[PDB]
Structure formats: structure tokens, C-alpha cells
Amino acid sequence: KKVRPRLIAELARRVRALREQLNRPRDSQLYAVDYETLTRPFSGRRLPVRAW
Amino acid sequence: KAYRGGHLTIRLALGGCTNRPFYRIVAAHNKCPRDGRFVEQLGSYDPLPNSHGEKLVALNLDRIRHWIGCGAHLSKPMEKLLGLAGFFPLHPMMITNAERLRRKRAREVLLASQKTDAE
Amino acid sequence: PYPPLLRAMIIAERQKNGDTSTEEPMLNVQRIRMEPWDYPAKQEDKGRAKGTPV
Amino acid sequence: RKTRHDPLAKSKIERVNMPPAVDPAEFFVLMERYQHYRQTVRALRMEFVSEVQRKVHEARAGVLAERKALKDAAEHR
Amino acid sequence: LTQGLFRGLSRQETHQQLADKKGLHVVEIREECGPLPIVVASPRGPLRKDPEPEDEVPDVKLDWEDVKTAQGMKRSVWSNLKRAAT
Amino acid sequence: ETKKPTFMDEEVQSILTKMTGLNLQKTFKPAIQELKPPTYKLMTQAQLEEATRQAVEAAKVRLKMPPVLEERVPINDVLAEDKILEGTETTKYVFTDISYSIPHRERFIVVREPSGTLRKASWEERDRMIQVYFPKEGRKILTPIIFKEENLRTMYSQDRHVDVLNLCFAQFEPDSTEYIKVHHKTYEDIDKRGKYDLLRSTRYFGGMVWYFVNNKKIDGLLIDQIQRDLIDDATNLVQLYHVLHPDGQSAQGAKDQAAEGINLIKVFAKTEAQKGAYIELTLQTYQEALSRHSA
Amino acid sequence: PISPYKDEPWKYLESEEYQERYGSRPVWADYRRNHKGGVPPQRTRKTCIRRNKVVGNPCPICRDHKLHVDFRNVKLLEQFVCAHTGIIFYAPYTGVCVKQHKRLTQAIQKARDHGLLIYHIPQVEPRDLDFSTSHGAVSATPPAPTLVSGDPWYPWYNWKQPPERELSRLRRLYQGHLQEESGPPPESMPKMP
Amino acid sequence: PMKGRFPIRRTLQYLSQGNVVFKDSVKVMTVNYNTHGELGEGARKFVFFNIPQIQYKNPWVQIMMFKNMTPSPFLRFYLDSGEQVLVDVETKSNKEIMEHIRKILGKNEETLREEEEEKKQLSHPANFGPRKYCLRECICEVEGQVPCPSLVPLPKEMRGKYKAALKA
Ligand code: FES
Ligand SMILES: [Zn+2]
């Protein structure tokens, strides 16, 4: 009943959370838009046709 | 089992064999399978008319009122069964789908009339 | 008003319990403040996009 | 169904779902029906919620329940 | 098998001998006839006035084969088979 | 003012109970069912008398006469009419509240017709749905074919009237039209063929006496009791008749003459009884035979 | 083989040809199956007749073409039912084929439905404890106001023509994606003449 | 035959005949009896016949026995509140003991029927499901309703094979 520890599962979890706080994208990158193709280059996703 | 988030829902769980559908009303978690595990069975619905030409619907109103008071949602087909019964109001789209049917059938009466009249 | 069925089940409990009354059961919708669908929500409880640029 | 890591198909790349047409009359009439229907149901839900809170509090803290818990303790002595 | 079968079938006590032995009424209880007591045999001699002493627990030797069946534990793929008329 | 006794009155229950009598051989007739090896007990004379007494206590619970009710009123009630749903469906929905802790005569069962009308289900539909979700042993959804005219006559021909009454009590409700029709028809066949003994020592005898009395057909029964040395029951039948019909020629005549015992039969035989002549002859024969035994 | 008792099968059991062949015993008494071992198979052969051809050892029903399994021949259906428990024997007991044992169970159940065959009918208890129709469920309910005036339960079931200023908002809200405005619907459902 | 003396004790039919169902307060029951002495006769029979009956009805109650520790037999119960119930069982039969503890610490017949009735509501007859939990699996087992296609084939107009063909 004594669970064998998983240390690598906790190490990466802390590293990921940290990197998400130091490499976090800004609103300038996230909410950018190409006004010709009408797509956010960050994710390459098209906007809805009603917002064009 | 433990699901991330989710909530309880009163939906229909399809049953029966091919070309013979039979739904059983149940309260189950939102993420659980359609015909999987449920919390409680609160009724049953037989779409196919019986010998007398009538569709049967069982409802445990005493228990449906218990789960709706505990935070349970409802599915659209199940909200249309409670409106047909008088437990809930007639769902808005049950009304609009009827108006669309009226206008549609009145649109066919013109062509039918014109053909018989013109020709 | 209460819908047809629920109305019939609340009027029958009255008569079964002995209470005799001709008043109509009705739902108090004054508490329910229905806001429009375009009402500003809370942004301090809203999520954010993750850092996976494509 | 797919996952976050699975890629996208090449036939859905150049796909655009155009929204349906709108009937000005029906759209407004239908937008009011949902407004009332959902208010009529929000009241019912609150009623049923009050009944589940009552019974529970009644069961653990009730007149009859506390009238029987004392009888069992008095009969025990 | 034959010498023992005829042996036990001849040393069996009837309902009449039992009553005469203990001077009591032999009553038959049937589920189909409800609680009706059916008198199958009565003693020819003087009927005793005192009842038999009711026994809390009887010290009678049991058979594990019968007890194991009454408890739904005797599994067998050869018992209760459909056979011809006998 | 002055209410006429009902079928459940203590005075009438005792009278109909005594007429029925108690017969253990017929009350606990061996059933044709799955059997087990019987169990035997060594009993004394007193232990045997107590066991025979416990069978009498249990037989009076098996002879409990069912209550007699009147034909229930049809159900014609509309909760709502939604004309907007008209034409949207071809068949009707039958909703049934299924909650365990509710009596079936307080249970809500509604019907949404294709015209958008939300009415309550009729008696025929209520009893049918209650059997789908709360089945009862012996009852069937679809009405059997045994209760038809031709098939019922067959059962009568085999002297199986008590079997037809047990089928009718397990398939229909006491206040249903079919429960009354089937019972009344059976009562009218017995009166025709004089088979009153069949229902004796049963729970269907009182209900049969209650029908002949209210419809004045106690001539045949009253004769049979006399032919079986059951004067006590024969006189109680005339006493009962007088009670339910106080303003009758026999009832008024009795008061004037203060008739008692056998006299009541004579007063009733001449004044109101249809078969006055036959009764007097039958009563005559009995009284003569009884005199010889007294000697 | 055309049996003369086809229409009136109950006359063959009360004849002398049946008594000279069977006597007082049932038709399945002098029948034994041919199987390997002491324990026989738990199912009998599907049928003794295949395309107007009879097998070597037919069953008690298929060997005599004058025995017709009908719900009216009560005297033949009693030989396949226990006189002490009122239960129909399984096929291995009598030796009949499945095809005829399926026909017997029907005829035996159809004769009990017509009152021709005697069977145990128990004395059950009533379904309900009370027999009082003093409840709305079974009685009339006060018609609601909207039902007496011929009005819907809720006002928003009926079509209500919205103002013009509100439609212009929608038209402006959905410019270039629009559909022809629909007027109030007809009062009742049209029908195809 | 079955080993041991009085083999009926080792039967389910005899273990379920006990009428002593302790309450929730009772946690521990300690029995102290003497192997010899005419006075302690009943206590020995109570340990030989009934303790099996008591433990089968009260499986969550600890029962511990001690031999020849005191000159006289006695029972002692330990409740959850800290109260102890001493019971002198000297000069008494096994039946008197079994009947005495049922009156001071055992449940009555009114408290038992209630619990049982609750269970009956756990199996709703209207529900449809496996034979283990529910009486019926599908609604085709109900006469009047449409049978299962396995037994009675459906009409050609009610099968999706031809609905598609008739339409196209
Ligand atoms: S099981 Fe009910 S339809 Fe096949
Ligand atoms: Zn055959």
C-alpha cells in the first residue's frame, strides 16, 4: 500500500508552470490579426465571418 | 469515477434493438457515456406506437423534482417531453416548428390549388 | 401561472390535506432578474490563451 | 474523437461555415420566448431547491425527529 | 444394493405404529392444503394427555450433502436433468 | 333520519357470514400446484383442537367478502387545450407519474392528444398503464377472451363459477363495469340452475345474496336453504329482505303479526314472494319431516 | 394420408381403434428414444417429418397421423400435463419433437383461455387498499381562467407582431445575411385538399 | 455426516434464527463464564448455541470471551458513549439471557420492519434493466408494445433499410 514515489512527475510539473510564467505570451502576440487574411498569426485561426 | 468538472444531467439513454428504439430516462453525469453508468432511472419512453396507437412515457415526477433541486440540467428532447405533459412550459422551438409547418403546408395549398384551378 | 400538470398536483394536495381555497397557484418571477445576453460578464474569472504559438 | 495533439485534415483547411439566414420577425419573436420560458423555469428550479434544503434540515434538525431522539434516550435510561 | 434396499424398505415405521408407540396423533401438514391439520393415524389405545417436551435444538446427525444443497452451494452439471418417464 | 344498512355494516356482515358457513375441506381444497413432501407432527387431543382452531381463524381471513361498490363515473376532464400543437403529431402521448409511495387511485395519468389537448386518461387507460409499470400477478394488459359470452357459458357448463369470479377479481377492479357485468351475469346463471351451493363457504356468497335482495330474486335461494335444513339462514334472509325493503307487504304484515322463526317465511311467501305456492309446499315438507325426528 | 378426424379430432380418442392400439395408457407410454449413453440429450429432434418424409422412429404424435393437436381435443392434451401439478412435461419426458411440443404448449394455453382445460386459479388480493374516487386525478379539476376564455396557458404561445424599430435593428445587425420577413402564422393548420 | 456435536449450529437456517439485533450504541460484548458449577450451566449453553446467532446478526460488534476469571458468570457491554452495562447471568437459562439482553439493548420489531421497508423502494418495478437489478430489460416484453425484431420481424415500412430505398 506504500506508493512508490514519482519524482519526475512533480519536477516537470513545476518546470512547466514556471515556463508558463516566464515565456507567457503577451496580448500583442496573442490578439494580433492580419487584416488581409483575417487570421491570428499566433494560432493561425480564422475569425468568424460576422466579425470580419 | 471522477470527472474533471462536469455536472448531473437528466437525459435519454437509448436502448432496444435495430429499428426498435426504446429510451430510458436517467440522471447521469454529463461526461459519462450515453448508455453507460447513471445515478438514477427516472422514467422510460417508447417512441413506437402500441396496438392502441399511443406512445407511453413514464416519469418519476417526485424524483425529477429532487434532482432539479440539486443542480441537474435537462436535455432538449427531455424538456420537450415535460412540455407535452404539462410539467414544464411548451419549449419555444416546439412552437416555432409548428408555425413553420403551418406556413409550409399553406405554401403547398397554393400550388395544389393553382394546378387544379389553372389546369 | 403554474403549468397545467403542476397546477393540478398542487391543487390536489390542498384538497387532500383539507385546506379549502379557490386561489390560483402562481410563480413569483419578481426575484428572477433576467439580464440580456450581451451583458458584460466577469473578466477576472475568465481564462487566457496558452503559450503554444503555431 | 480526436485529441489536442492529432493534426487537422487537408480537406477542412479551406472550409468556411457561413452562418444561416435570419428572419427578422421570427428571430425577435423567438428571442422573447426563450426570455420568458427560461424565467418561468428559473423560478421552478428555485422552488425545488428550497424543498431539498428543507427536508435535510428537517431530518437532522426537526420537530418529529427531535421528538423521537429524546424518546429513545429516555427509554434507554 | 438389492440386499440393502429390501432391508430398509422392510424396517420402515408406518404412521400407525408410530402413534401406538407414543400414543399421540399423527398430523399431516401440507402447503397445498394450507394450515389444515390432516389426521393420518391415531392410537388404538389410551391417548396420552401430556405433550412431547419441545426441544430447543435437536441433536440429530445431518448430511452435508443435503445441507449443502439447501444453502445453494451444491453445484453440479449432472443434477436435475431432463430425462424420460419412469 | 333512517339510513338503510350498507353491505359493510356490522349487522349485515354477521348475517352474510353465518349464511356462508365454514367448511375446511372446501375452504382449503388441495391445490393443483407444485408440491413438496409434507411434514408430520406428533400432537395430543388438545394440541389438535388448537391447530384446528387456528385453521378456523385463517379461513375467516380467506373468506373475507370483497366490498360491493357502484359503477365508477367516467373521467372527462381537460387540463388544457394547446391549439398551436394541432397537426404536429399523428399519435398521442400517455404520460404516467411513476412514484412508489403513491396509491394508484391518487396517481396522475394524463394524455396529450394530436390536437394539443391535455386531458386525463380514462379508467380503461389508467388500469392498463398501472399494470405496465406496477404489474400484479394474475392481471393482463389486454382483456382476456374468457370473459366473452360464449366462453363464459362454457365455464358455467362445467360448474366453475367460483373460478370465473377469481379471474374477474384479479383482472378488473371492483368498481369497473366489467367486474359488475361479469359478476351479475354469473349470479343470474346460478339462480336459473339452482347452483347456490357452489359459492357456499366462499367470499363470493355475500355479494350474491346482496344482488338478489336488492333486485328481489331470493325465491330460489330461500328454497335451497330449506331443502338443506338451514332454516336459521332462511329466516335471516327474510329478515334482511325486510330491512332493505321496510315499505313492503311482507315487512308491514310481519309487524302486525309479529311473525318469528318459520312464520316469517310464510308471511313473505304469500305477500311478496313470486313463487308463493312452491315455497309453502317446500316449507310444508320440511316441517313434516322435522316433526318425525322430534318424536 | 388424409385423416377422417381432421375436423373432429375428439372422436378418435373415444373410438375403438384408439383403444385397441393404446388402451387406457397415454400415447407416449410405449415410446423409447435411441441415444448413446445413459443420459440423453436435453433437446429432442426438431421434427420427425422433413419434406413429406418420416424418420425411422417417429414420436408419439408423428407416428399416428390420426392424432391432431388442437385446442378442442382436450383428452389428448391432458396426457401431456401433470394431473397433480398442472405443469406441461418437457419433451424428453414424453419424447415428442420440438415442433409438436411447441404446438402442444400453444393448444394447451389456448384451451385454458377458452375454459376447456381445468387449471388452478388462485385467490389473489385486491390491488388497492382504498376504493375512494375523491381525488382530482380521477375527478374534474377547476378549469383555469385561460381555458375558459379560449386563451393559451401563457401569452407568449401566440404570435405577436414586433415593432418596426426592432426589425430595423436586426436588419442593421445582419446586413447582407437576411431572409424574407414572415407574417403572423395562420390560425389553424392547413390541409391538403 | 457433519462433524462435531450439535451440527445444526453450523447452518445458515439456524444462524438466522437469532432475534437479538443490537443497536448502534453497542460496540463490545464481553462474556465471562465458568466451565464448571451448576450455577453457570446456562452461561455455558449460551456460549455454545447463541453466540453464533448473535455474531451473525451483529458482525460489526466485537465479542470476546474469558474463562474462569471470576467466581460467577456475567455479561458486560461497552457502548459508544462510554457507558457500561453489566449483566449478572448466574442461575439463569440460555433463553432467559437471550431474552433479557434483547429487552435492554436489542431492537424491537417496530424498529426492524421500518428498515426492511426502505429496501423495497430501492427496486422500482417500473424501471427497466438487467435481470439482476430490474424485472424487465426492454419494453418489448410488455404485451401490446412492439416486440423485439429478434422474435417478430418488423414491417418493411418500419425498417430503415427500405425507408431509404423507398425514398431513394
Ligand atoms: S430487446 Fe426489446 S427490442 Fe430487442
Ligand atoms: Zn414428431
From Swiss-Prot, chain A:
- Impact of altering E10K? In COXPD32; significant decrease in protein levels; destabilizes the small ribosomal subunit resulting in impaired mitochondrial translation
Where would you find this protein in the cell? Mitochondrion
Identify its protein family: Belongs to the mitochondrion-specific ribosomal protein mS34 family.
UniProt subunit comment: Component of the mitochondrial small ribosomal subunit (mt-SSU). Mature mammalian 55S mitochondrial ribosomes consist of a small (28S) and a large (39S) subunit. The 28S small subunit contains a 12S ribosomal RNA (12S mt-rRNA) and 30 different proteins. The 39S large subunit contains a 16S rRNA (16S mt-rRNA), a copy of mitochondrial valine transfer RNA (mt-tRNA(Val)), which plays an integral structural role, and 52 different proteins.
The disease tied to this protein in UniProt is: Combined oxidative phosphorylation deficiency 32: An autosomal recessive disorder due to deficiency of mitochondrial respiratory chain complexes, I, III and IV, and characterized by delayed psychomotor development and neurodevelopmental regression. Additional variable symptoms include poor or absent speech, inability to walk, and abnormal movements.
Function, as annotated: Required for mitochondrial translation, plays a role in maintaining the stability of the small ribosomal subunit and the 12S rRNA that are required for mitoribosome formation.
Protein known as: Small ribosomal subunit protein mS34
User: Which gene name belongs to this protein?
Assistant: MRPS34
Shown residues within the full chain: 4 to 55 of 218
Swiss-Prot record, chain E:
Location comes to: Mitochondrion
User: Which residues are connected by disulfide bridges in this protein?
Assistant: none
Concerning its family, UniProt says: Belongs to the universal ribosomal protein uS5 family.
Subunit info here reads: Component of the mitochondrial small ribosomal subunit (mt-SSU). Mature mammalian 55S mitochondrial ribosomes consist of a small (28S) and a large (39S) subunit. The 28S small subunit contains a 12S ribosomal RNA (12S mt-rRNA) and 30 different proteins. The 39S large subunit contains a 16S rRNA (16S mt-rRNA), a copy of mitochondrial valine transfer RNA (mt-tRNA(Val)), which plays an integral structural role, and 52 different proteins.
Tell me the protein's name. Small ribosomal subunit protein uS5m
Its source organism is: Homo sapiens (Human)
Gene it is expressed from: MRPS5
Give the fragment's position in the full-length protein: 345 to 430 of 430
Curated annotation (Swiss-Prot), chain F:
Which GO molecular function annotation, any one, does this entry have?
structural constituent of ribosome
Q: Which UniProt keywords apply?
A: Acetylation, Disease variant, Mitochondrion, Phosphoprotein, Primary mitochondrial disease, Ribonucleoprotein, Ribosomal protein
Record text on subunit structure and interactions = Component of the mitochondrial small ribosomal subunit (mt-SSU). Mature mammalian 55S mitochondrial ribosomes consist of a small (28S) and a large (39S) subunit. The 28S small subunit contains a 12S ribosomal RNA (12S mt-rRNA) and 30 different proteins. The 39S large subunit contains a 16S rRNA (16S mt-rRNA), a copy of mitochondrial valine transfer RNA (mt-tRNA(Val)), which plays an integral structural role, and 52 different proteins.
Compartments reported by the entry: Mitochondrion
What disease association does UniProt give?
Combined oxidative phosphorylation deficiency 5: A mitochondrial disease resulting in severe metabolic acidosis, edema, hypertrophic cardiomyopathy, tubulopathy, and hypotonia. Ovarian dysgenesis 7: A form of ovarian dysgenesis, a disorder characterized by lack of spontaneous pubertal development, primary amenorrhea, uterine hypoplasia, and hypergonadotropic hypogonadism as a result of streak gonads. ODG7 is an autosomal recessive condition.
Tell me which Gene Ontology terms the entry assigns under biological process: mitochondrial translation
Question: Would you say which domain of life the source belongs to?
Answer: Eukaryota
How is this protein annotated for GO cellular component? mitochondrial inner membrane; mitochondrial ribosome; mitochondrial small ribosomal subunit; mitochondrion
N6-acetyllysine is found on: K148
Q: What is this protein called?
A: Small ribosomal subunit protein mS22
Swiss-Prot record, chain G:
* Superkingdom per UniProt: Eukaryota
Compositionally biased residues, Pro residues: 183-193
Q: Which UniProt keywords apply?
A: Mitochondrion, Phosphoprotein, Ribonucleoprotein, Ribosomal protein, Transit peptide
Gene of this entry: MRPS18B
Assembly, in brief, is: Component of the mitochondrial small ribosomal subunit (mt-SSU). Mature mammalian 55S mitochondrial ribosomes consist of a small (28S) and a large (39S) subunit. The 28S small subunit contains a 12S ribosomal RNA (12S mt-rRNA) and 30 different proteins. The 39S large subunit contains a 16S rRNA (16S mt-rRNA), a copy of mitochondrial valine transfer RNA (mt-tRNA(Val)), which plays an integral structural role, and 52 different proteins. mS40 has a zinc binding site.
Which GO biological process annotations does it have?
mitochondrial translation; translation
Q: What is this protein called?
A: Small ribosomal subunit protein mS40
The answer on whether this UniProt entry bears the keyword Phosphoprotein reads: yes
Q: Where is it located?
A: Mitochondrion
Could you state one GO cellular component term attached to this entry? Answer: nucleoplasm
Q: Which residues form a coiled coil?
A: none
Provide the family line: Belongs to the bacterial ribosomal protein bS18 family. Mitochondrion-specific ribosomal protein mS40 subfamily.
